[PDB]
Each structure stands twice: as structure tokens, then as C-alpha cells.
Assembly symmetry: C3
Homo-oligomer: 244 residues x 3
Amino acid sequence: MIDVIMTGELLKTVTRAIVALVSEARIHFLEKGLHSRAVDPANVAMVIVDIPKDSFEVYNIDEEKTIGVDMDRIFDISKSISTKDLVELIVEDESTLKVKFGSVEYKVALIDPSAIRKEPRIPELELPAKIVMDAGEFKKAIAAADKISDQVIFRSDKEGFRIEAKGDVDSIVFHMTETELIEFNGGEARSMFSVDYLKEFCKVAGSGDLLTIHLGTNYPVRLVFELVGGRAKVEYILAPRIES
Amino acid sequence: MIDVIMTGELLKTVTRAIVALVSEARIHFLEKGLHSRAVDPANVAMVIVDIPKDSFEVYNIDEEKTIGVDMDRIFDISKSISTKDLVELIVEDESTLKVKFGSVEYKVALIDPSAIRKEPRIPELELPAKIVMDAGEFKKAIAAADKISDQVIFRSDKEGFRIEAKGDVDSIVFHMTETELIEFNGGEARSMFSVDYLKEFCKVAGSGDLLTIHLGTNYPVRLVFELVGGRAKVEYILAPRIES
Amino acid sequence: MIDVIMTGELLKTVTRAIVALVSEARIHFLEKGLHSRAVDPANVAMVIVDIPKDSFEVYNIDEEKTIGVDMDRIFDISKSISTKDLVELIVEDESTLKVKFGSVEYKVALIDPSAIRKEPRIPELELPAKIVMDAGEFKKAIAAADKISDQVIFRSDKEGFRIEAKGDVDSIVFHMTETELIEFNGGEARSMFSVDYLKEFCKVAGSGDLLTIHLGTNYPVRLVFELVGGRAKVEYILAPRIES
């Protein structure tokens, strides 16, 4: 059996992060905690979620188990859950997931894991640039860029980190030097990405959340967000466009 | 003449509660206070509003009087009124209603009471189950059920009160025991109702408001809400569906 | 060169006030401060904006300069600016405007002032009535009138200031006596105006902002708003309808 208790905000945020890309997903309850990964239909973005066992109020599992979940449903139900509610998830067999919060108990039929798209592999990306900043600040940068173009360039070097967008008659540059960043290795990298996806990624993040960016040149970017008081790690990987 | 003064929130809430079902209504200014009742077009729900004279800041009437009011208009005008404004209602003759608040005076033509649908009678429902709880908690239960089905079962017995909804692959159960409820008589009852109407009823209620449910088996349910600091009694009665 | 620093709220509010009427505008950086005036396409309303140099945190200009600005763009970009951000505007040449706030630098191509509709002249209106009140209160009056009609009468005399609207079966009167107003000269005047424009004007104002109304009979009304902590003067002039 699986029986865990987590804050409502933790469940709502991780559910929202996953459903942003897929409507169904395999959820692994491992000895070390919860894990889930998925790639979107267009194969342009991937999401990797990790909730260490210590981020849960209670984490009791017998054997490690994988369940198939209808993410659209859990997301819909999560909207009736308060961020301040404590939520208990229970799986006694293999066909039903119980979600309890307040005076309510929701029961949803699980999906056969095999019926879900094959479990994707995590790319062993070798990236030279590492940038650590506030997720809210990043979110604002993307929001500003979104008003100028549908594509942005991420650039890193010894002088800092920049996010640039160019339009027909206007342009915008977000720039932070090493001293302004939380952590920065000065690695040299430059890649271009779709603003649409970046904007969607930021919907589960805000001021106070940590963001670690792993960047290369003409390589997918890794955006590692630490959310909900640092209880969850939500990494989004986005394929690159041609930077020239 | 009729001359009363009430809080903006009191007028806004009671107006909203009535217009939810009808666009016109007879408003009775009785020695004991304000009274109004109406049934919706489909004859599926009824609303009974009572504002005791002591809930008003000022309640001065000569003789008991009944006026016909265009509820869509009062509701529209009430949107320009603040919950913290004090509102004065005046009827000097029989054709005009004056609504004063802030530095504004609104005058609306009254409707001939006779032109309005016959005054409905209050059903003398004999119900075995009585449940008293927080209206906000009830509202949340209905909101959760609404995500699962368009119908819900209300069930009461010695073990408490439950609200259940079932879908094709999921279900939800809200349950509170006698100790969790404010007041409960343990009466046995079970009826099914439309979530659409229940959801609409709850729009004028929130955490802190009292709700008394009178329930029977295959009988209309009585939902007595005490709103605006307990100043108004707004009872909604909803016809049942077949529970089996 | 032009180099000024202002609060985000100041830029956002003045930008919104101007774009309400036009999509392009001439902005004058004078020794005494910023000035801009424009009339809408229908020639029914005009806006005159004045930001004294002392309302800026920094105001450094070489020679007085006039620039042409795409107001739709600045407005769009201003949405990514926080009211609490400090914004720096820089014009080093004549073709580019730099907008800096936070860690972002926006560059927009300027418009040739000549390509913009001829600079309008300020009408030397001679009006007998002067009314000073809270802009938020005025805004509420217009909002109330808007529910009754698409036209309102502004009336002033020794007994105070009134805003009246009449519908088929209802009416509304907003009235404030001399003692209730901040300043009032008791001038006699009566004119009728379009609620649509008045409502739009009030979108940049709120409680706490000062409004000085200059009113005549069958003459355009002057609505002088002092916004953003009294840092900006935004005057709207609205052509009259036939009052009878």
C-alpha cells in the first residue's frame, strides 16, 4: 500500500507542472520519494518532477510502486483543494487512488501504466553554463520578452547572463552580472528558445522560488525550479531553435 | 410611507439571492420586518427571504405594504453600492422606490404587484433530518461534487451527514459526523439533487454563515442560510430527483 | 540627450491616460517638465498631460526636445513594469527611446514627430463653475449613472454640484453641496455629456486623487485630474451634447 500526506500547495503545484505538458503520466513512489517524468506531444519539452520523501508530512510505502494517473482529472480536483489543506493520497490496490482533504474523499480510477506513453529517458546533457537566480525575476524577464517576440536568446559569459528578444522596431535585454546572481560559473553559452514554452513553465513558479539554469550552445536548456518552500524539484527541458 | 436603512451588504446579498431565481418579485414590508418569496420559472426551486426589523439600522413603516420590484434593476444598481455603504429605501407613494447611498439617490418605478406572478405558498414540509453546519464548508462540498457529477446524494443517519457524487470513473464523498457538525439530530434521510441549483444557492453564502439543512427521503430539501452577520434568513428549497 | 527617472506608477498612469485617446503622440521634454496633448479620432475628447520636472526623481535634459512615440507599444511594455519599479527614460539621438527598469532595458524606435497628427491647440475656455472633489467619488458617480443612461447632465449653482442621469423608468442623481466639496465657487452652469467618455477618463483615477471640474453651459467640460500622489496633471476635455 501507498499512504502519503502532503500540503495542498505541493500537490497543486506539481500537478499543474505536469499537466502543462501531458494529460496522463506515470507516477513512481520510490523509497527516496515521488518521481515523474514526461515529454509533451510535440516532443519540444520535457518535465521531471522529484519530491523527496522528507518533503512529505507522512510517506509510508510498502514496496516501490508505479501508478498511471489521469492528470487532467487530478488537476481538476486539485482546484477544489486549498493550498493550506493537508492532502492524503492512498493506493491500497492497483486500480484506485484515494485523495483525502478536509472532509472530502475523492476516488479516481488509475490507468494501466503500460497504456501510457513509454517512460522517457533523461538526457545526459553536458552544459558549460550554470546560472542560479530567483524564479520570479526570471518569470518577469520572460514576460517582458513575450511582449517583443516569440523567441528569445539566452546568453552567458564571464560578464553575466542575458535574455534578449528582438522585434521589427523594438528589442529588450534582461541582464544580470555575476554579483547580481545567486550563483554563476561564468560559462560561455548561447542558445535560442520559444517564449511560449518558457512562459508556460513559469506559471508554477514565483518570487522566492529558486531557479538553476543549465545552458549550452544550440543545446536544450535545463530549467531546474525548486518550488513550494523548496519541497519540490521541477525541471523543464526545452529543445533549442537555431541561434545565429 | 416606508423608510428603512440597512447596510449595503444586506441589500446586495438579499437582492442577489432573489434575482438568482426571478427577475421580478413582491417585497412585503411587515411590522416584523421584510419578507419576500418566489419560485423560479422551471418550478424547481423556491427562495424565501426574511429580514427581521431588528436587522435594519432604521425600520419605519406606517402600514404594512407590498411593492412590486424589478429585481434585475435593483441588482444592477446594487453593484454600484459598497458593502460598507448604508442604504436608505423610501416608498412615499406606490409607484416609486428611492434608493439612497453615499451622495446618490436612485429612483425606480415600482411594478404593480398584481402583474407579478401569484404569491407562492410555503410548503409545510415534514422532514426527519436536521443538520447545522458552516455554509462555507457546504459550499466547498458542492464545489467538489460539481467537478464529478451534475447530481448529488444527500444522506443522513446516526453516523452523520454525507454528500456523494459519482461519475463514470471517479467519485467523491463529503462526510461529517455528529461531533463535527454544529447541531445534528441523527435523522435518517436520503435524497438526490441537482448540483447546478445547489451551486447557485451557495453564491450568496460563505465561511462564517450558518446553514441549517432540513432533509427527508425523496422530498425537497430546505437550505436555511443565515447571512450578513446573521441579519438575513435566506431559505432555498430544491425539488428532488429520483434517489435509488 | 534626455535622461529622466520616474516611478513606474507615474509612467504607467500617464501612458494609460494618453493611449485612451490616441495610439501615437508627441512628447515634449521641456525645461519645466514633460508635456503632451492629443485629441481622439472622433474629435470628441482631448487629453493634456503635464509632469513638472520636480515630479521626477531625476530630470536631465540638454535642450528642449520633442519626440514621437508609439503609445500602444509603450503601454504594452508598461504592463511589464511594476508600480514600485523606478524607470529611466533615455533618448541619446532622435530615433531610439531606451526604457530601463529592474534588470531590463527596452529599446523602441521613435516616430518622426511630423508623421504624427498636427499638435492641437489648447482651447481658451471661459467657464463660470469650478468644482473640486475626490476623483474616486466622481468615478463612483459616473459608474452609477452608467447603469441608467449613456448621457449625464452636469449641473452647478449656489446649492452645489449635481450629476444626473435619466432612463425610461429610472433615474439617478449625485449631489454634493458646497460644504461637502473640497472647493466650490457656486457658479451657475449646466451641460450634458457622454457617459462612455467620462467612464474611460476615470480609469486612470481613484480615491485620493484630486479632480477639479471647470463647467459652463453647452460648453466642453474640463476635468483636471491630479494623479500619482499629485505628481501628474492629466486634463481631459469633453465636447458637450445638447442640454435642454
